[PDB]
Design a protein around this ligand. Structure first.
Ligand code: BEF
Ligand code: BEF
Ligand SMILES: [Mg+2]
Ligand SMILES: [Mg+2]
Lengths: 119, 120
């Protein structure tokens, strides 16, 4: 019933806000600040949806997206300050389920997470 | 970019509702059920606005308001079931930035929080 969410974000304020919001909404939440931790927790946590930052410190979020898609089909919503149309198109084409540009409106993020968690 | 808010409320239902509301609105939110926790988090959390209940268990919210104002200028919106005009005037004069009587419409509360956090 409770849906697990994996957040891959390196910006602390946004980590805090997303964690808090999705906890209050009744979701189990895990957060990581790096792509490697994101892979390890994709394996161990077995999440139901991934929220992915593209400006990650250790790896380009696009390449981690491409890999995770090679190994999984879990819904991934990209949330990145990268607002160039080419970044959005590459992310969707690399298999992403959605793209949200930062800064965003928390209600819209929640609505899209709900859309992905209820196929 | 991220705006912090501190809620000081002791009724669980209202805590839950305000927390949910202002998290879904994209605010960082902290909650306390006592005046002492409110002071500790006023110092540590450094919020951008405080929503303050006056019917607190450990201290009269009015006195906590007076003190917090003695040491700070952060916006404080009072939200209390005390509906007599005398309480509202005492709270405003003791430094409160706004007063909302319970029961209230969450839209009015949100509009006033936005007015305090983005004073144009
Ligand atoms: F750091 Be990513 F661009 F959100
Ligand atoms: F408990 Be508060 F006075 F509404
Ligand atoms: Mg970043
Ligand atoms: Mg009370």
């Amino acid at each position: 019933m409770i849906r697990k969410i994996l957040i891959v974000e390196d910006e602390p304020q946004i980590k805090k806000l997303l964690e808090k919001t999705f906890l209050v909404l009744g979701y189990d939440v895990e957060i990581v600040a790096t792509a490697g931790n994101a892979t390890k927790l994709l394996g161990e946590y077995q999440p139901d949806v991934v929220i992915l930052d593209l400006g990650l410190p250790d790896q380009d979020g696009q390449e981690w997206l491409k890999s995770a898609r090679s190994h999984s089909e879990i819904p991934i919503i990209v949330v990145s300050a990268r607002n160039d149309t080419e970044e959005v198109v590459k992310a969707l084409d690399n298999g992403a389920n959605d793209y949200i540009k930062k800064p965003f409106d928390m209600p819209e993020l929640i609505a899209r997470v709900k859309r992905q968690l209820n196929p």
